[PDB]
Design an enzyme around this catalytic site. Structure first.
Site, PDB file in Angstrom:
ATOM      1  N   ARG A 177       0.885  -1.162   0.000  1.00 20.37           N
ATOM      2  CA  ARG A 177       0.000   0.000   0.000  1.00 20.37           C
ATOM      3  C   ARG A 177       0.930   1.221   0.000  1.00 20.37           C
ATOM      4  O   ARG A 177       1.002   1.967   0.974  1.00 20.37           O
ATOM      5  CB  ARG A 177      -0.886  -0.012   1.257  1.00 20.37           C
ATOM      6  CG  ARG A 177      -1.839  -1.218   1.358  1.00 20.37           C
ATOM      7  CD  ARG A 177      -2.424  -1.385   2.763  1.00 20.37           C
ATOM      8  NE  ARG A 177      -1.365  -1.498   3.764  1.00 20.37           N
ATOM      9  CZ  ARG A 177      -0.598  -2.569   3.941  1.00 20.37           C
ATOM     10  NH1 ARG A 177      -0.773  -3.656   3.197  1.00 20.37           N
ATOM     11  NH2 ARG A 177       0.400  -2.527   4.813  1.00 20.37           N
ATOM     12  N   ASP A 242       4.040  -8.314   6.630  1.00 21.81           N
ATOM     13  CA  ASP A 242       2.839  -7.578   6.277  1.00 21.81           C
ATOM     14  C   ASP A 242       1.482  -8.288   6.259  1.00 21.81           C
ATOM     15  O   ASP A 242       0.517  -7.816   6.871  1.00 21.81           O
ATOM     16  CB  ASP A 242       3.071  -6.881   4.930  1.00 21.81           C
ATOM     17  CG  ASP A 242       1.997  -5.864   4.604  1.00 21.81           C
ATOM     18  OD1 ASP A 242       2.089  -4.719   5.089  1.00 21.81           O
ATOM     19  OD2 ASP A 242       1.064  -6.213   3.859  1.00 21.81           O
ATOM     20  N   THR A 243       1.402  -9.413   5.564  1.00 22.96           N
ATOM     21  CA  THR A 243       0.134 -10.115   5.404  1.00 22.96           C
ATOM     22  C   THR A 243      -0.730 -10.440   6.631  1.00 22.96           C
ATOM     23  O   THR A 243      -1.887 -10.017   6.686  1.00 22.96           O
ATOM     24  CB  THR A 243       0.314 -11.344   4.517  1.00 22.96           C
ATOM     25  OG1 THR A 243       1.594 -11.275   3.874  1.00 22.96           O
ATOM     26  CG2 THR A 243      -0.762 -11.367   3.434  1.00 22.96           C
ATOM     27  N   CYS A 348       0.533 -19.983  -1.037  1.00 27.18           N
ATOM     28  CA  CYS A 348       1.275 -19.409   0.084  1.00 27.18           C
ATOM     29  C   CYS A 348       1.978 -20.431   0.982  1.00 27.18           C
ATOM     30  O   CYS A 348       1.326 -21.242   1.634  1.00 27.18           O
ATOM     31  CB  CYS A 348       0.338 -18.565   0.946  1.00 27.18           C
ATOM     32  SG  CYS A 348       1.192 -17.664   2.280  1.00 27.18           S
ATOM     33  N   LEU A 349       3.304 -20.344   1.055  1.00 29.47           N
ATOM     34  CA  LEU A 349       4.089 -21.251   1.900  1.00 29.47           C
ATOM     35  C   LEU A 349       4.016 -20.883   3.396  1.00 29.47           C
ATOM     36  O   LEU A 349       4.292 -21.717   4.280  1.00 29.47           O
ATOM     37  CB  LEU A 349       5.544 -21.301   1.413  1.00 29.47           C
ATOM     38  CG  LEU A 349       5.750 -22.057   0.097  1.00 29.47           C
ATOM     39  CD1 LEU A 349       7.145 -21.788  -0.471  1.00 29.47           C
ATOM     40  CD2 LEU A 349       5.527 -23.550   0.318  1.00 29.47           C
ATOM     41  N   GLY A 350       3.591 -19.650   3.673  1.00 29.58           N
ATOM     42  CA  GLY A 350       3.462 -19.191   5.045  1.00 29.58           C
ATOM     43  C   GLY A 350       2.056 -19.382   5.583  1.00 29.58           C
ATOM     44  O   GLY A 350       1.740 -18.890   6.668  1.00 29.58           O
TER      45      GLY A 350
END
Ligand code: HEM
Length: 405
Positions: A177, A242-243, A348-350
């Site tokens: 952002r 961030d996510t 997504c690996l996380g």
């Protein structure tokens, strides 16, 4: 600013949606994006905003494009695209087969076994942060929990000094952002610049932290190079810092507004994993895209080589064709369909670390501060981008209703 409409794009497919400042942002970010899925709006539109690009609006098209890496490549230019610069993250900016060897090493640093190891530190931090807030009867959720909880766990995992948080947090913000003080190319390079000396240090004096593992890692039996390690770690920092931060605020904002949903989780804690998944669908927040490798007709639409296409991961699960009453949060929802963590070879690996952090937050929070609300008179603002978020979330509660643990 609206970029002139390309000759190959039909006028009836134009829908000037701005992913960084959507028209109905005031109704909530997911709501603003959902306007794209209305019957009046085509399944695939072209927006002249941000340089001009396609936007697949329906989950079926979004899923299909993510599966077809041959036509829809991850060698992504930015949006707005920048001259002579493009994404070069690993393994995210690569298409299989090349991409594959890199996922295994990345999976080794943020995957399930790692999450299991972190389990107790994760539980400890959540409890520690929540207990200090509990007596206050108020808090600014975004900065008091949403940010420090996931970020400190990630810095721990990465073996990075917590003093580096303000700097890294500013940079990752610019990659999702952006406020306009940096280009995506400058933000990314600064992230890389930060990592370079750290990778070199750990390559020579390895530790067990995520940076050491990548720096001393092997991709398909071959040693990863300093540059590949830099590009992978740069991507990991964006995802790890961030996510989850932004997602937590969407979930807590919702809970603060629905006493009925809070009580449900309070009485039936076994439903928390299910609630996490449901909340991931309803408050999905990522939206990135691909680039066309050749001229290709997709669902009756002629796409041109080099055309950029945004495939909003957030939109799939909000699609009423995937879930009935998609804007309604139902913890008992039978088949929670979504692409929140992605779709295709780039899942997504996380995601395991994310779910663990959300689930722990929900349990620890509702167990200590069961009843809470949004500060009276507060106007909650959302921000849209590659990863949408919540500006601020002032919460209030009566300390007498809290349980100390
Ligand atoms: C709720 C939180 C999260 C959400 C919703 C999320 C979502 C996504 C999405 C949609 C993608 C696919 C992007 C694409 O196809 O181009 C992705 C990729 C990835 N995410 Fe996340 N993510 C989250 C948390 C994290 C965290 C905590 C990390 C930790 C470092 C992380 C690491 C990654 C990695 C390494 C990939 C790359 C996979 C590849 O390119 O093959 N994510 N994430």
């Amino acid at each position: 600013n609206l970029a002139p409409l390309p000759p190959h794009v039909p006028e009836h497919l134009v829908f000037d949606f701005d992913m960084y400042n959507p028209s109905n942002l005031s109704a909530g970010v997911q709501e603003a994006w959902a306007v794209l899925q209305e019957s009046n709006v085509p399944d695939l539109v072209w927006t002249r905003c941000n340089g001009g690009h396609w936007i697949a609006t329906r989950g079926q098209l979004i899923r299909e494009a993510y599966e077809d890496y041959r036509h829809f490549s991850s060698e992504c230019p930015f949006i707005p695209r920048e001259a002579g610069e493009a994404y070069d993250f690993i393994p995210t900016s690569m298409d299989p087969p090349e991409q594959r060897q890199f996922r295994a090493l990345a999976n080794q640093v943020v995957g399930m076994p790692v999450v299991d190891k972190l389990e107790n530190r994760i539980q400890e931090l959540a409890c520690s942060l929540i207990e200090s807030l509990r007596p206050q009867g108020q808090c600014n959720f975004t900065e008091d929990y949403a940010e420090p909880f996931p970020i400190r766990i990630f810095m721990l995992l990465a073996g990075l000094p917590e003093e580096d948080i303000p700097h890294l947090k500013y940079l990752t913000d610019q990659m999702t952002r952006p406020d306009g003080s940096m280009t995506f190319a400058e933000a990314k390079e600064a992230l890389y610049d930060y990592l370079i000396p750290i990778i070199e240090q750990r390559r020579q004096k390895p530790g067990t932290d995520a940076i050491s593992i990548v720096a001393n890692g092997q991709v398909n039996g071959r040693p990863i190079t300093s540059d590949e390690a830099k590009r992978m770690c740069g991507l990991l920092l964006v995802g790890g810092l961030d996510t989850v931060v932004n997602f937590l605020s969407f979930s807590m904002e919702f809970l603060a507004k629905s006493p009925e949903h809070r009580q449900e989780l309070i009485e039936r804690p076994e439903r928390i994993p299910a609630a996490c998944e449901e909340l991931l669908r309803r408050f999905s927040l990522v939206a990135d895209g691909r680039i066309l490798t050749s001229d290709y007709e997709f669902h009756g639409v002629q796409l041109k080589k080099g055309d950029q296409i945004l495939l909003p991961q957030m939109l799939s699960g909000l699609d009423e064709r995937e879930n009935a009453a998609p804007m309604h949060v139902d913890f008992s929802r039978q088949k929670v369909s979504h692409t929140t963590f992605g779709h295709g070879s780039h899942l997504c690996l996380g995601q395991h670390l994310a779910r663990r952090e959300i689930i722990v937050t929900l349990k620890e929070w509702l167990t200590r501060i069961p009843d809470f609300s949004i500060a009276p008179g507060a106007q909650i603002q959302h921000k849209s981008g590659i990863v949408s978020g919540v500006q601020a979330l002032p919460l209030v509660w009566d300390p007498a209703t809290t349980k100390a643990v």
